[PDB]
Design a binder for this molecule. Structure first.
Ligand SMILES: Cc1cc(Nc2cc(C[NH+](C)C)cc(NC(=O)c3cccc(Nc4ccnc5ccccc45)c3)c2)nc(N)n1
Ligand SMILES: OC[C@H]1O[C@@H](n2cnc3c(NCCCc4ccccc4)ncnc32)[C@H](O)[C@@H]1O
Length: 543
DNA sequence: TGGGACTTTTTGA
DNA sequence: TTCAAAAAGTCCCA
């Protein structure tokens, strides 16, 4: 059930400027209505609009058809259309709409109990509103997913979600110059799975307004990040998009009378984006952030992908069989040649990695089971059956006791930079102990030919600065509240510079690292040093 | 007596 | 063969 304030805002967005005199026959459709939250409000708005202009309609059009008593009949016969796959919800909505008037003559209501995706829609609609489903995400039957792939290949592919198709349908059954307004998950704005959907939306309909609630819990006790999309197929020319991005993600929806108050308050920021300039990722930032990003982009000759090699950590496939506490007695049963240091995302802070508390048994270096039978029977064998169910173990590529994805040792066993894949701030650390990591920590090392131009200390100095924190967070994907995804497809696109301030920045980074490494630890001066470094970086970027 | 925050491994390519 | 993206369940505090 969509919150009432959201429904009211969507309906008002769709209908507030409709010319009832010019077209007293608007078709307003809810593809997925359920209990009918949108359609009841649409009925109330339409009744008020008709009763407001009833005498003008009577003068212009037929004088006998346009009477106050006949408004209910007209609305239910020509104006309101709803669809659903639940018969009980359809019957409830039908009963509610019938009771909206309170049997002399036959009354017809345009309600459909069918699959909106597989329905042959007879005619298009002036206004389309509502809330596509999200409860069924990956529970679609194999035949249904095949149908979606075959019939919705332009928006649905593999990991695409169901509601994507709804968008396409809503665009297709929309009358020329009509208006659509939906509330959906916001994930398609930034997820790679929705690139086709975003291109389909951009090239067909003019988007008017995007309300981005980010991680704010719009739906009570439901963990979905929602956004409201409004669009039209009118003959516009410039097609600028209003964007209302939330600022405080901890606000309460119920603490406002109307959504206009919330949007116009300090809890939201507004900015305009030229639709013709939209990229594939749909980067939505204000003027100041855009200028900041542009200055940093034009000031930096190199990028991390240009000067570094990135890789994902070890994926054992069963961590319980290969990861042990470094004080475990079973580590006396494993030759120290096969033991590597193991760290977690919690072990990585700025500029340094904590001492590894865990050891990884690099079982890929074990040749035969006869020599090392003790390890394979008393430590790793405890999960053999589960180890036997891995895909490569079943296919014969990988032996049962080996790591499923052991990567390359020489990648990990070198001076490199490691960072967690999900964090609230930039945390890039220089690894000195040849640490191995799971997939929750990504790593990269500087290319051989760029070692003379860039040093690891300088890289972690600039990358951990507040300037680069803002620079990354501008275009980073926000997967949850106060959490950013740090994946190579975004991290390796970070652009880096080098100028006359390089040596001082490197020296400050070395000072911070040395302070962080010693015994008598108090952060203190580090912060001060950081501040100076940031000044230099801003001096380098003219910001 | 409810109520959401995090990490391992599955899988398309 | 192997990479890397992204999917996927359990549990504790006021
Ligand atoms: C806050 C809180 C809490 C709790 N608990 C717990 C917690 C944890 C962590 N940390 C501490 C927080 C954990 C637990 N378990 C289990 O099993 C585990 C382990 C590991 C890992 C994992 N992951 C996963 C899985 C699957 N899927 C998914 C999906 C998404 C994401 C993720 C995920 C899980 C429990 N409780 C309450 N009450 N609260
Ligand atoms: O907010 C969601 C509301 O909307 C209805 N609804 C869902 N999905 C369709 C829908 N088509 C897609 C069908 C997908 C599917 C496939 C296999 C098994 C189950 C579902 N058509 C009309 N109403 C719908 C729900 O019943 C509910 O009232």
């Amino acid at each position: 059930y969509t919150p009432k304030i959201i429904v009211d805002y969507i309906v008002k967005k769709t209908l507030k400027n409709h010319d009832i005199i010019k077209n007293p026959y608007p078709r307003i459709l809810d593809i997925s209505c359920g209990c009918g939250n949108f359609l009841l409000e649409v009925y109330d708005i339409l009744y008020d609009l008709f009763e407001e202009n009833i005498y003008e309609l009577k003068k212009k059009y037929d004088e006998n058809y346009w009477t106050v008593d006949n408004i209910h009949r007209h609305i239910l016969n020509y104006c309101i259309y709803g669809a659903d796959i639940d018969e009980k919800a359809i019957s409830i909505l039908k009963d509610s709409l019938t009771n909206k008037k309170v049997d002399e003559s036959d009354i017809k209501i345009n309600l459909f109990c069918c699959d909106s995706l597989k329905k042959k829609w007879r005619y298009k609609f002036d206004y389309i509103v509502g809330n596509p489903p999200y409860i069924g995400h990956k529970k679609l039957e194999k035949k249904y997913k095949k149908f979606l792939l075959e019939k919705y290949s332009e928006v649905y592919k593999d990991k695409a979600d169901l509601y994507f198709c709804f968008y396409k349908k809503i665009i297709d059954i929309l009358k020329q110059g009509g208006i659509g307004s939906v509330i959906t998950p916001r994930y398609f704005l930034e997820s790679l799975s929705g690139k086709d959907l975003r291109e389909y939306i951009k090239s067909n309909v003019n988007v008017q307004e995007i309300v981005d609630f980010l991680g704010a819990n719009i739906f009570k006790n439901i963990g979905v990040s929602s956004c409201i999309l409004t669009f039209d197929k009118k003959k516009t020319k410039e097609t600028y998009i209003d964007v209302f991005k939330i600022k405080n993600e901890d606000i309460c929806i119920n603490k406002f009378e109307t959504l206009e108050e919330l949007l116009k308050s300090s809890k939201f920021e507004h900015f305009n984006i030229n639709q013709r300039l939209l990229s594939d990722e749909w980067i939505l930032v204000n003027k100041d952030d855009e200028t900041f990003y542009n200055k940093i982009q034009e000031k930096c000759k190199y990028s991390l992908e240009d000067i570094a090699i990135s890789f994902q950590g070890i994926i054992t496939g069963c961590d319980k069989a290969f990861i042990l506490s470094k004080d475990d007695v079973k580590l006396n049963l494993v030759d120290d040649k096969f033991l590597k240091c193991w760290i977690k995302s919690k072990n990585i802070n700025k500029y340094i990695v904590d001492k590894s508390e865990y050891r990884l048994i690099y079982s890929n270096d074990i040749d035969n089971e006869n020599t090392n039978k003790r390890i394979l029977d008393e430590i790793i064998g405890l999960y053999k059956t589960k180890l036997e169910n891995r895909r490569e173990c079943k296919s014969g590529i990988r032996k049962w006791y080996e790591l499923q994805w052991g990567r390359e040792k020489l990648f990990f066993e070198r001076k490199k930079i490691m960072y967690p894949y999900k964090s609230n701030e930039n945390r890039f650390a220089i690894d000195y102990d040849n640490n191995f990591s799971s997939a929750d920590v990504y790593s990269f090392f500087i290319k051989e030919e760029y070692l003379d131009k860039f040093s690891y200390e300088y890289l972690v100095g600039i990358l951990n600065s507040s300037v680069y924190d803002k620079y990354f967070k501008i275009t980073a994907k926000k997967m949850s509240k106060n959490i950013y995804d740090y994946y190579p497809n975004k991290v390796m696109k970070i652009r880096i510079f080098r100028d006359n301030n390089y040596e001082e920045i490197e020296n400050l980074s070395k000072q911070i690292i040395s302070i962080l490494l010693n015994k008598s630890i108090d952060k203190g001066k580090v912060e001060k040093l950081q501040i100076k470094m940031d000044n230099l970086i801003m001096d380098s970027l003219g910001i």
